[PDB]
Amino acid sequence: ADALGMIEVRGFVGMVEAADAMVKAAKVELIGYEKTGGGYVTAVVRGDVAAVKAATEAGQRAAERVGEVVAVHVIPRPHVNVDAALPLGRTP
Amino acid sequence: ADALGMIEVRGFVGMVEAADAMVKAAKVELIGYEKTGGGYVTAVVRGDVAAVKAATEAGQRAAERVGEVVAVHVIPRPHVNVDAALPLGRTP
Amino acid sequence: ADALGMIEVRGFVGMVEAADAMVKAAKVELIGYEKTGGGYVTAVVRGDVAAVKAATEAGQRAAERVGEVVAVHVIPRPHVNVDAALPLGRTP
Amino acid sequence: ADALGMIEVRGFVGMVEAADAMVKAAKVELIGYEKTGGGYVTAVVRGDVAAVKAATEAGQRAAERVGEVVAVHVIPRPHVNVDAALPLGRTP
Amino acid sequence: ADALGMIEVRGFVGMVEAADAMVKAAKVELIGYEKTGGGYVTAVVRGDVAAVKAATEAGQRAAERVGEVVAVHVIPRPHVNVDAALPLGRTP
Amino acid sequence: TLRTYIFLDALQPQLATFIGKTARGFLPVPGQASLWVEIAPGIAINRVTDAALKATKVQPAVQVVERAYGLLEVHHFDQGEVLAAGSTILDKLEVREEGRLKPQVMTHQIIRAVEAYQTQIINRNSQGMMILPGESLFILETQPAGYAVLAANEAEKAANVHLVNVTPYGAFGRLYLAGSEAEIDAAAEAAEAAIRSVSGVA
Amino acid sequence: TLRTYIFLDALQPQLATFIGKTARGFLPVPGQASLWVEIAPGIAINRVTDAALKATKVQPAVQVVERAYGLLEVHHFDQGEVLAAGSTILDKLEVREEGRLKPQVMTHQIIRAVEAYQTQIINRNSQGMMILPGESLFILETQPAGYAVLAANEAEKAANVHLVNVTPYGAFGRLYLAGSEAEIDAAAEAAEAAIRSVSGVA
Amino acid sequence: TLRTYIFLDALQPQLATFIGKTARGFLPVPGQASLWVEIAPGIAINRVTDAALKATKVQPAVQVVERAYGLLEVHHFDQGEVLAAGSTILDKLEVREEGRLKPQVMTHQIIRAVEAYQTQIINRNSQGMMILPGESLFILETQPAGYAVLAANEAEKAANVHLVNVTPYGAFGRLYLAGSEAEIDAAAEAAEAAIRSVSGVA
Amino acid sequence: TLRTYIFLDALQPQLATFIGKTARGFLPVPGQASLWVEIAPGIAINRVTDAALKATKVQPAVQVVERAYGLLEVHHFDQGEVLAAGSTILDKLEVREEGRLKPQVMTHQIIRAVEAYQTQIINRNSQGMMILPGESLFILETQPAGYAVLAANEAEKAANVHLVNVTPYGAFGRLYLAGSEAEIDAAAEAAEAAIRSVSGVA
Amino acid sequence: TLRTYIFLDALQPQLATFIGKTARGFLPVPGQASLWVEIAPGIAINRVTDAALKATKVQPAVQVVERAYGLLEVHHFDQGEVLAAGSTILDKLEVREEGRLKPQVMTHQIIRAVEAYQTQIINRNSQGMMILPGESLFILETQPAGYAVLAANEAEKAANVHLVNVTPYGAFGRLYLAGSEAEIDAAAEAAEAAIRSVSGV
Amino acid sequence: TLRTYIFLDALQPQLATFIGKTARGFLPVPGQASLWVEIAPGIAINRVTDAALKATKVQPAVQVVERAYGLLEVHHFDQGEVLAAGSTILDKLEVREEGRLKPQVMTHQIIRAVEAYQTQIINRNSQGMMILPGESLFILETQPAGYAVLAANEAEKAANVHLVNVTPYGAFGRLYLAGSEAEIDAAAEAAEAAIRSVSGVA
Structure with a gap:
């Protein structure tokens, strides 16, 4: 299964800059974005483990200047129930 | 793949004033506005780089008189995945 | 020749939890374990560097709260003589 | 007779790292490993006098970063009774 | 054309102690001894350079306890005329 | 003055291949030992090289004279030959082992996911393996110049x-x-752990 | 006289990297569509290039006026631009699609486990990725010279x-x-099947 | 340390042609906007270049590292792209517009009617258009080195x-x-008026 | 075997400038008289050159031995010296004026309003003045190779x-x-009239 | 297709010096025994070289893949090694000793007392020792191209x-x-007699 | 600032041959005079070279500008021409004969019986006559840089x-x-006697 890298920012501008600097700094796939309400938006990139790790470590470094970065996380091998339950880019 | 400009305002009135100042300031195209919930709304203009770089500065100068401007940022060349997945006006 | 990941625990229980956390963390292959006497055992997984670098860190973070972790080390390319002479799960 | 190089490390991880340093830093024959209980494992390389003296330098330099190095030693010509009675690789 | 090690001792006893120390300290070949008269005798060992350079130092350190060591010198690559004309063990 | 005295106890294949690609001398093969000596001033190594060539079976590859940075690589299979050539070089210079300058790391940078336009500039001005677009890039400066081959x-x-x-x-x-990114991280760890684990004069 | 007209639908990254390492012209990136036209005499390709640059928005990398023959590379992302440039070139030359010379394989060999003494010479005399000792080599010649990029x-x-x-x-x-051996074997099968899949004039 | 930050808002065709004759990277065409950055130290531009290549559509030509004078040319049709690339470069360095060194003219000599023997040495050690015997020659030194393309x-x-x-x-x-003499006089007046109309740290 | 015997009565300044930019010998100046002799085989021209240097005071600029052919330039201010050197050459070769091969034009084309993408390539691999974008271009090939300087x-x-x-x-x-357009039209008319006015052996 | 198979029992020091000045490979020393195999097409020599390196311990210096031809030099001190490498090469190509092309002399000249205006061009357009004005010159073309090293x-x-x-x-x-004049004359006699003593096709 | 002003009154044949092998300029012949003027700074010699070429019949070979060491050689048969060119150069600079720096010998070494491995590195990085193995080697440094041709x-x-x-x-x-050994001894004696017999400012 492909990996997972999520950046949750309070603000759409920080999420767009995060999701831009993640795809400019690795070979990942920006599959979408999640709007959990109250200003919190989460950008999701997906690919092999070192690429999404470098992508989140660049997207955090880019989005802290233009917003409020709340969460930065990488899951290297998510279980298939997460991809089959949550809208995270690998729903069969 | 024109350049990108976003104004995030806590408040609809400041966002409408920012969107009014940006399209009067230069050659941009207000493609829409994103409502992340909780009062944050982000107006998006899209055009070539020295137009949006003056437009977002005029929108930051005007929208600080009326509301709480959270983030002002210009992306000079957005990646094709950002335009393809995120709702930033140029979905093919 | 895949990369090497070794977790040495003074105790069988911490080693089994370390091996479980490694094989649930990334895509590795638990090839076995070594019993060097005196209560020291060593779980050995093997996979490419991006997987095992995160796998051994997850195994160390999940093996400190169970047993006593002695050594954690990742060898990105073992030589063919180590795989031929020592029991590291790639004996020809 | 072929010259003898021995690295005794308290732990299997430091021994595998020391053997990986030795068989890459020179041109020796890693004949095996000796387990004397209590976590003391000894890697044995065996080449000529130029090779093992430069192999165990990298072994001592690379095994101190991962654990406890008990002993590092080079014998340039082991006596024939030592290779006849002790299992150090050249047992007839 | 292997390397060369020579220990000159004023006295037979120190030369025999040096020739006994050198062939134990490394893999060299004691080819002979040269009686130049007046008490000076020169033990000659022969092998690759890191054996003879670690052999003649141990032979000097052993033969200083018993006699008058005149000269200790190692020749890493003796010329083909030196091996061919002088009695240094490798006359074709 | 001895700037760099480093002994590569084994030449890994891309390093020996790259040295043999830009060698003003005899070409090395992988598996051999190696010795790099960088001194100040430069022209005196024209004597010193010859001393090594009179002493041992070693065989030189790169010998650069620039009146402030001499250079000499000598390589041979038998590591005793290369160590005795090192002793010959240090005896001709009348300096010691610890008299070398301790290397310091000036700048290490990892420039992950290089765009293709930068790869054109990098591979046109290089000789080794080509950099592909999207791969990472580890750049390094060491002081003095001779320890970069040790880092490589x-x-x-x-x-x-x-x-x-x-x-x-x-x-x-x-x-x-x-x-790839994790292998570049491991190689960066290797280069940083290899440069500052060298004893010398600060 | 059209000698080679080959249309690369997508540049694999090491090929585009190697071309942009040794090009006299605008450097291509991977993923672009390429077109190779080799004609004789060698100077008339300076006409032919101009025809493409008057019709389409294609972009040239390799325009080499060699000692006998003339070679043109043009490339662009959109394949419609490159195909229209190829149609403009074939109408300026007033030849058909299958007017090129049929490519002929002279020597196709797999050399398994190349010794170090051969590898040092091979990758001293090359401008690409270094061959390492112990790797299987594949050597190939095609006549005319323009079809080698198709095989690569x-x-x-x-x-x-x-x-x-x-x-x-x-x-x-x-x-x-x-x-590696299986991958060189698959590359050899693919190249020997790809050169013979080109029709033309014997 | 920013030595030179200059923005050539239009590449006049002989300058763009000379740049494209000795371009390391992607070579430009005339009519394009260009930007030249010279910094100290040198290898730090290898990061900074990539930053511009992540930000804008610009494409580089000359990227020279010499550990004390880095260099980066970028160029594109749209002048906003090149200005935003320069803003990205100045933000990565955390320096400003006025942090550049003010260029000084250090030699300007007009050699009227250069005879033939000198022209052989001048064109044998140059790349641009040939000098003819009897034509006037304007030579110029500017400090720092990056401002010479502005005068050209x-x-x-x-x-x-x-x-x-x-x-x-x-x-x-x-x-x-x-x-010819009056045109060299007008070009000398233009270069001297163009160099000392640049603001910066003296 | 004499392939080319051409006699330039006066070198134009750009031609002599271009020759002296890339000559392996004694650099000619504009206004001198020149004589180009290309023979096959290529090494035997070293005899022929010596013959001129044993008779006259003419001076050689370009004496180049290629893969197949050998080219000799000789030049002097006095046309009597150069014609006596040519008589010495034709008596050493024991051939006549019309024993040379007749020059054949393979491709004479005028490329009007050359695009910038091509003009960034033509002088990327040239040795003289830079073609500028928008300038019309005349390309030409003559066989044998030595007549082309006359065509220049x-x-x-x-x-x-x-x-x-x-x-x-x-x-x-x-x-x-x-x-410019009509100016290279007149140049192309003059060169095509100059090549076809040379007699010899077909 | 074998074009040139020549065997040098001993290299003169200026020849081995010039070869090791302009080689792409493992440079020979004076006194070694050498072997030169030029075949067509030029890429199959990359096979042929490998065959020698799978049989003997010889070292290659000059392995040049030309426009249409391909040249291999191998050398070692033991002539048994070099002759076994040559036997492995000639059995890999499945040809004989006389399967090579017989070399033709296209031009041989002794140019006496070369004046300075020619010597400057000759030495600028060369890679070995400098010619001096007043020295007699000997020029030579051998076809195929490999046999010239024998002619050296x-x-x-x-x-x-x-x-x-x-x-x-x-x-x-x-x-x-x-x-000098007599030494160039003896060199010309020796080179012509060496080229005309090679059998072939 | 004048660093080196030396008047080679006769070019001995290997020196004139070596200069005419690597000169970016007109080539000298053996028997001519010479004049090696080296100044500080560099680009001013672009005027000063012209000051020779207008005035006298002299004719240059080497003209190097590096903004710290500007150097010039001129050569002609008549030694009065070369002395007049020297007087014109020293009048253009407004310096005198004794304004030159007195050359000091930094490092002279006689390396006898050079082994064959060192000869490869020496002749691969040189242009003159090939050093043969077993022959002696004399290396020399002079201050300033221009006085090495005097000792040569x-x-x-x-x-x-x-x-x-x-x-x-x-x-x-x-x-x-x-x-050979005694000839290298006599040449070393001659070079040391020729360098320190030059008047100047220490």
Whole structure:
């Protein structure tokens, strides 16, 4: 299964800059974005483990200047129930 | 793949004033506005780089008189995945 | 020749939890374990560097709260003589 | 007779790292490993006098970063009774 | 054309102690001894350079306890005329 | 004055291949030992090289004279030959082992996911393996210039990276590496752990 | 006289990297569509290039006026631009699609486990990725010289190899590839099937 | 430390052609906007270049690292792209617009009617348009070296001269121009008026 | 075997400038009289050169031995010296004036309003003045190769163009000429009338 | 297709010096025994070289893949090693000793008392020792191109000359020698007698 | 600032041959006079060279500008012409004969019976006559850089040696010589007697 890298920012501008600097700094796939309400938006990139790790470590470094970065996380091998339950880019 | 400009305002009135100042300031195209919930709304203009770089500065100068401007940022060349997945006006 | 990941625990229980956390963390292959006497055992997984670098860190973070972790080390390319002479799960 | 190089490390991880340093830093024959209980494992390389003296330098330099190095030693010509009675690789 | 090690001792006893120390300290070949008269005798060992350079130092350190060591010198690559004309063990 | 005295106890294959690609001398093969000597001033190494060539079976590859940075690589299979050539070089210079300058790391940077336009500039001005677009890039400067080959040797020996360029001469030693991100991280760890584990005069 | 008209639908990254390493012109990036036209006499290609640059928005990398023959590369992302440039070139030359010379394979060889003494010479005399000792080599010549980029592109597309060298201009186009044994075997099968899949004039 | 930050808002055709004749990376076409950055130290531009290549659509030509004079040319049709690339470069360095060094003219000599024997040495050690025997020669040194392309751009933009050479690297920036006497006078006036109309740290 | 015997009565300044930019010998100046002798085999021209240097005081600029052919330039201010050197050469070779091969034009084309993408390539691999975008171009190949300097010389004797690149040794002698439209039209008319006015052996 | 198979029993020091000045490979020392195999097409020599390196311990110096031809040099001190490498090469190509092309002399000239205006061009356009004005010059073309190294070696083995240049790969093998008059005359006699004593096709 | 002003009153043949092998300019012949003027700074010699060429019949070979060491050689048969060119150069600079720096000998070494491995590195990085194995080697540094050709001329003039590489441009002047042992001894004596017999300012 492909990996997972999520950046949750309070603000759409920080999420767009995060999701831009993640795809400019690795070979990942920006599959979408999640709007959990109250200003919190989460950008999701997906690919092999070192690429999404470098992508989140660049997207955090880019989005802290233009917003409020709340969460930065990488899951290297998510279980298939997460991809089959949550809208995270690998729903069969 | 024109350049990108976003104004995030806590408040609809400041966002409408920012969107009014940006399209009067230069050659941009207000493609829409994103409502992340909780009062944050982000107006998006899209055009070539020295137009949006003056437009977002005029929108930051005007929208600080009326509301709480959270983030002002210009992306000079957005990646094709950002335009393809995120709702930033140029979905093919 | 895949990369090497070794977790040495003074105790069988911490080693089994370390091996479980490694094989649930990334895509590795638990090839076995070594019993060097005196209560020291060593779980050995093997996979490419991006997987095992995160796998051994997850195994160390999940093996400190169970047993006593002695050594954690990742060898990105073992030589063919180590795989031929020592029991590291790639004996020809 | 072929010259003898021995690295005794308290732990299997430091021994595998020391053997990986030795068989890459020179041109020796890693004949095996000796387990004397209590976590003391000894890697044995065996080449000529130029090779093992430069192999165990990298072994001592690379095994101190991962654990406890008990002993590092080079014998340039082991006596024939030592290779006849002790299992150090050249047992007839 | 292997390397060369020579220990000159004023006295037979120190030369025999040096020739006994050198062939134990490394893999060299004691080819002979040269009686130049007046008490000076020169033990000659022969092998690759890191054996003879670690052999003649141990032979000097052993033969200083018993006699008058005149000269200790190692020749890493003796010329083909030196091996061919002088009695240094490798006359074709 | 001895700036760099480093003994590469084994030449890993991309390093020996890259040295044999830009050798003004005899070409080395992988598996051999190696010795790099960088001194100040430069022309005196024209004597010193000859002393090594009169002493041992070693065989030189790169010998650069610039009146402030001499250079000499000598390589042979038997490591005793190369160590005795080192003793000959240090006896001709009348300096010691610890008299070498301790290398310091000036700048290490990892420039992950290089765009293609930068790869054109990097591979046109290099000789090693080509950098592909999207691969990472580890750049390095060491003081003095001679220890960059040591950094390249240990970085190849640890990880699975592509050797792009190394510069053993000049004011400071440059090193470029390419490959996937985790292997570039492991090679960066190898180069940093290999440079500052060298004893010498600060 | 049209000697080579080949249309690369997608540049594999090591091929485009090697071309942009040794090009006199605008450097291509991977993923672009390429077109190689080799004609005789060698100077008239300066006409032919102009025709493409009057019709489409294609962009040239390699325009080599060699000692006998003239080689043109043009490339662009949109394949409609490159195909319209090819139609403009074939109408300026007033020849058909299958008016090119049929490519002929002179020597196709797999050299398994190349010794170090050969590898040092091969990758001293090349400008690509270094062949390492112990790697299987694939050597290939095509006549005319312009079809070697087709073999390089297809052999990289259908395998996992390292491009050591390719020479798309001259009397005979040459290809040096290196890699593991099964991957060199798959690349050899793909290239030998791809060169014979081109029709033309015998 | 920012030594040179200059923005050539239009590449006049002999300058863009000379840049494209000695371009390391992607070579430009005339009519494009260009930007030259020279910094100290040198290898730190290898990061900074990539930053511009992540931000804008610009494409680089000359990227020279010499550990004390880095260099980066970028160029594109849209002047906003090149200005935003320069803003990205100045933000990555955390310096400002006025942090650049104010260029000083250190030698300007007009050699009227250069005879033939000197022209052989001048064109044998240059790349641009040839100097003819009997034509006037304007030579120029500017400090720092990166501002010489500005003087070359403005001297071509004002007068009808031939660009013999411009060296934008090293310690001092070199400019060789050739042509008839009044046109060389007007080009000299333009270059002297263009260099000292740049604001910066003295 | 005499392939080319051509006598330039006066070198135009761009032609002599271009020759002296890329000559392996004694550099000629504009206004001198020149004589180009290309023979096959290529080494035997070292006899022929000596013959001139045993008779007259003429001076050689270009004496180039190629893969197949050998080219000799000789030059002096006095046409009596150069014609006596030519008589010495034709008596050493024991041939006549018309024993030379008759020059054949393979491709004479005028490329009107050359695009910028091509003009960034033509002088990327040239040796003379830079073609500028928008300038019309005349390309030319003559066989044998030594006649092309005549194709250069008269083409500047009857027009005012820029000599881009003339290759006078080869299998195919090549000529590039840039400039404005009607002016290179007159240059092309003069060069095509100059080549067909040379008699010899078909 | 074998074009040139020549065997040098001993390299003269100026020849081995010039070869190791302009080689791409493992440089020979004077006194070694050498072997030159030029075949067509030029890429199959990459096979042929490998065959020698799978049989013997010889070292290759010059392995040049030309426009249409391909040249291999191998050398070692033991002539048994070099002759076994040659036997492995000739059995890999499945040809004989006389399957090589017989070399033709296209041009041989002794140019006496070369004046300075020619010597400057000759030495600028060479890679070996500098020609001096007043020295007699010997020029030579051998086809195929490999045999010129034989035409070098014997021409120094039976004279005392200065090797200006030798080009052993291309459509014509080239030799420039310079020296005193009698020594250039003896070198010319030795080189012509060495080239005309090679059998072939 | 005048660093080196030396008047080679006769070019001995290997020196004139070596200069005419690597001169970016007109080539000299043996028997002519010479004049090596080296100034500080560099680009001013572009005027000063012209000051020779207008005034006298002299004719230059080497003209190097590096903004710290501007160097010029001129040569002609008539020694009065070369002395008049020297007077014109020293009048243009407004310096005198004794304004030159007195040359000091930094490092002279006689390396006897050089082994064959070192000869490869020496002749691969040189242009003169090939050093043979077993022959002696004399290396020399002079301060300033321009006085190395004086020692080369006088050492060829005295003994029967082979000039290997004289480097007059750069930080300090290098000299390599080869040949038999007693001849290298006499040439070393001649070079040391020729350098320190020059008047100047220390």
